Design a binder for these strands. Sequence first.
RNA 1: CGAUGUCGGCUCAUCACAUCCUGGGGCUGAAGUAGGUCCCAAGGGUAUGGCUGUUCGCCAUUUAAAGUGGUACGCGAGCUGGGUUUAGAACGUCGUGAGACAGUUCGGUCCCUAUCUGCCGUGGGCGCUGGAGAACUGAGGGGGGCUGCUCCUAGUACGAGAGGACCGGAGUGGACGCAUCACUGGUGUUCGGGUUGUCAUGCCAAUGGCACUGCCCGGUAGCUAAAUGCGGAAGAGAUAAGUGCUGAAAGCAUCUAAGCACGAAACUUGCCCCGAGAUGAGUUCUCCCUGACCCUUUAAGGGUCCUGAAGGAACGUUGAAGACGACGACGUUGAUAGGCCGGGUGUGUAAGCGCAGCGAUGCGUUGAGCUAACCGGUACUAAUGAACCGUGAGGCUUAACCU
RNA 2: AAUUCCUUGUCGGGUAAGUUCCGACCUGCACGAAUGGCGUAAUGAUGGCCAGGCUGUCUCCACCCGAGACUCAGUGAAAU
RNA 3: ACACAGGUGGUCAGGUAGAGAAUACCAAGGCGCUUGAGAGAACUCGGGUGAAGGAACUAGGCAAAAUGGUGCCGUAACUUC
RNA 4: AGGACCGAACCGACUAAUGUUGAAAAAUUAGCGGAUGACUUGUGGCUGGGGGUGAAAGGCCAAUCAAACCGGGAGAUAGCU
Lengths: 56, 122, 114, 120, 209
Amino acid sequence: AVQQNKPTRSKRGMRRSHDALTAVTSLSVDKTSGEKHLRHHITADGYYRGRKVIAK
Amino acid sequence: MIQEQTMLNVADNSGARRVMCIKVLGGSHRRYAGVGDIIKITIKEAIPRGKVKKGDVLKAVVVRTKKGVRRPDGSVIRFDGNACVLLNNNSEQPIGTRIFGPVTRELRSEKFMKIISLAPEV
Amino acid sequence: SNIIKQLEQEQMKQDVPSFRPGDTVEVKVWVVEGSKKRLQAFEGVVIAIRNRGLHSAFTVRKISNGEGVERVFQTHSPVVDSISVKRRGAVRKAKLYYLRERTGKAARIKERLN
Amino acid sequence: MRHRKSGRQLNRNSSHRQAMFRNMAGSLVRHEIIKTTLPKAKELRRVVEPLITLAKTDSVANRRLAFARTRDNEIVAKLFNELGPRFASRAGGYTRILKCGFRAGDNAPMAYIELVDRSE
Amino acid sequence: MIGLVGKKVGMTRIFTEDGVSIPVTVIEVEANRVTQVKDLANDGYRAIQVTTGAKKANRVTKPEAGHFAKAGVEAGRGLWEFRLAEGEEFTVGQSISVELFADVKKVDVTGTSKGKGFAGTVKRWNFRTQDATHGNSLSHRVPGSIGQNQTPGKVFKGKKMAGQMGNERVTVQSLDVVRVDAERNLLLVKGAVPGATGSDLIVKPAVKA
RNA sequence: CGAUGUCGGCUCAUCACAUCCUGGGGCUGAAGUAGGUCCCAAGGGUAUGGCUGUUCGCCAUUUAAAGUGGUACGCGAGCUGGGUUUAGAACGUCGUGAGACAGUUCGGUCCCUAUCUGCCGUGGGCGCUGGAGAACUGAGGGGGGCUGCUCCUAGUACGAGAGGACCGGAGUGGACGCAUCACUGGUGUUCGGGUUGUCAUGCCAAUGGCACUGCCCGGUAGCUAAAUGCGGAAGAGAUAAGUGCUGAAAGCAUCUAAGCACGAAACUUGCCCCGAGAUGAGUUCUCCCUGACCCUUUAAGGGUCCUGAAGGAACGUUGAAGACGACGACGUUGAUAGGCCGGGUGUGUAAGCGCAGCGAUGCGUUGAGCUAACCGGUACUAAUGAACCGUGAGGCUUAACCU
RNA sequence: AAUUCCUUGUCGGGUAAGUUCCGACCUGCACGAAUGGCGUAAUGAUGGCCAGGCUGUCUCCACCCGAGACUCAGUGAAAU
RNA sequence: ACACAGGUGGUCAGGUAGAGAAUACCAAGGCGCUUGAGAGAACUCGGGUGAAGGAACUAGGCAAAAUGGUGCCGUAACUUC
RNA sequence: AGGACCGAACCGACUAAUGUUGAAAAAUUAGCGGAUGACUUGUGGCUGGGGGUGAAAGGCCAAUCAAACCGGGAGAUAGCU
């Protein structure tokens, strides 16, 4: 239930070798507004696939 | 699906009225008795001047079960109450002369032929 | 499942009579005793019907000279030779399992007549 | 192990889900576009769209049948008076989900679920 | 002999004439068509590689399409391979039908079983549950002990513990083939075979006597 | 002794063989059946209960048999806590007494979120020497091996009779394991209905909330077992004990020294599964990439421009796949999910209206209405054009061909 | 026998089977008369045993509903 | 020690059902408990249901299940009546 | 009438499960006992360390009890670690 020798910083980084974040990896450009957004999501201005939606 | 500790009714007129199963015979760690399977029973109740008295230990064959039997077409036949006929202990072929209630076509064998010579249905 | 639907309806018998639970039914059944092939009769109240096409069953409950018997029948089996409706019966449910607890005058089903 | 079961549980019991979709269906009928989580949108389709198809056939039994579900009388006025004759030829597909990012409070994948006309 | 690749259509029953229901599994076996023949002089073993079904044109890749194009055959949904039995002979592009089982009398059916996910040892290994009461403290379905003491001081290999049950290749042997229907491309075997409905099966003749 | 928890029960094993069963065999004071005893054999199998804290034991009833041991008298960071052995109390007995007795009796707190090894699963990286998509051979590893009874051979062989076979074959069980959901069922708080109390929707009617799903009655799909299918094998090889054949040393005899044949559930295969990280990194098929130009401490060296393939990954709709990754299907030239349409199934003849009744209610329209995960269809909704990763012919030596 | 070592005494009852339980015997190791003896209706979250009912206790577990466990975002320990 | 599931005396006490200050649902009034979003594995906790059997479990029916109201009928041994 | 009966508040604490680096240095949940009395409770007062108080357990006397806590003798002494 508890460790018996203090683990090293080696083993610590080895465990964290997988904790890395993946980048976005490329975010797509709107058809009409020409601005960037996550794919399959609406843009900050509220367009999606070149048509106007929300408009708040 | 009769196991140890199970109180069965009695279908013949041997004198017993209510028996308890104490082993399911026929194999090692065998769990259940069933359609026409032999058990060993003890007699928990009797009528006052029957052939078998209370606390005797003898064999019986299960003739009806609440769980029921399955036919080869998928049809089941459940009864309402488990019942046995008390066979003789050493050389079988049972004690009683009448048999009450129906029985099933799965006592159609050599020995239990006697049981289905009696037994008003099936 | 057009394969299975096509393949099962090649086996469904055509002349199954219309019955519903509550009905007293005589069912004639092929019983084989060695070489002779007898046909015996099992009459009782339909307490349950499962409709699944070929896999359609129905449970008939008789009180046979003593205690009560429930035969479940596969409707489209070749064993089940005849179904005939004796007394049409008027109940309110679809599965009449309460009748397992009733005998005699309590287990008494009114007649439907319409 | 779940095999072929349908319906999200949404970390609620059955009565809180039922109540929650009753409110949220009421809000989508009322405002025609609401922002919710993406799973709550995806379940809101299976609650909301049957009310529209019930509304496509106006009768006293369907008004009462859509007032047992939904439990609000303004809502069963807009269904049967506005939305039911609005769709009326649209066979399913009364509502669209538009994914719209993440919350700030708990990083939940939001989505705007809206009715499929909103031509106004 | 060789086998054929099917698809589990589901289960039904077959009422016999004397009134015995037989639980059958329906296996649609379309035209398995040979895409490659393998000889000792090039591969070290005699075996045929068959395909079956049909795949979308845009979903088959260029390696795969070039393989089926060499074979002179329509792309199927997969490639399988059957070892040959020393006097058998097949050509590439030859179609093989369920008619092959018109004599066989008993088959073995190989599929992937239904995946039950991470299963505990009561489901997985039929361990027996400890007391449900009588004092028992948080250990009802748990596996008990897992080994001995200082001697060995290790858990042995292949100790039955909990983990992924299901979703693996299983072969059911010696199933009675009830019908071969060359018209509808069907094989009715008696019993349950592995897999959910629509899963790919592999039906060979029975190797047992 | 700056703590190595100590009986018994449970769960879970695992090895030994000095073998309980099954298998082979020699001797018998072995007629047969059943035995006794000894050799070989560890594949698999090897009870349920009464009493007792008990291991043990006795008893009851089974069974082919209910093996003997090791594993901290296996197993308390897996469970229990009945016994022993804290503190209370009492009996018998001992002591003047405090108290004491492995004498008895009643009552009496069992913690730990796993770092490392191990183990069960499941992935990411890199390697395998151009990249990629598949199919494989198979080194090696694991699973599986239990067995009763009935019938025939044959009431033959044997025996005075009673009784009663070897060898061989057919059937059908028990226990165990794998799969599955067609059947029989269980569940089915996501479907339908009945009903009690109360609150609300203005009210009647109808509904809804809350009361364990309020209590119930049924029940789809899925999951499931008590359900239903299948399995343990035949065969081959090399043998153990054992039995021999020919045959000397030892002109006989002798199964062994040369040579040869049998011989068992053990052994190697046969059956099922994993399996190229098998760094010894294998094979086969297919697909893709056929540009220029500088610099130097001229190397399988570095850089710039142009190109970006096969394919993968991401994203999305998701799945009888799933802890998460992974795996599978589909992304509009599209049935992947939702909705919709038709069917099925389940419930059981809705609401409104009409009629009968003083009324509760009943009847007609009406097997009505509503129907979840099911089945068959349907682009109505959502699966976006793209971007991202991956390159540009793949080292050296030697050999055989360049027909 | 809350007392009995030998001891699971012996006989009887209950049980298919009862080291416990009830009745009895008395060879009381080592009861016994206000450190009270023996009875005792009622009472007891008292000790022991039996039976009816009832049941997932169990045979032998199965499914479902919820809260964690698992994944994501935020905060962020501990023994050792 | 905490913005701690604990402790803390008195006073007021509506409706319907109910014997009731129990209990259920409500009024006045006050709250939704200062981490959320998913998924729907094992396992743990709190619960629901369960075929046939029905204490075989076990140290021991522990736990669970069951019983459960009002009126009327009826009610044994024993007893200090 | 009753150290009467059933049963809430109120006082308690018999069983089980959870909790056991707790929500809590003794609780929660489901059952459980008493509930007009030798009851229970508020506010104040009194008893003090070989002393109190004790329907007696070596219990309680500020989370401390086979002799409280604080300060001092005091750097007690320690053939022991």
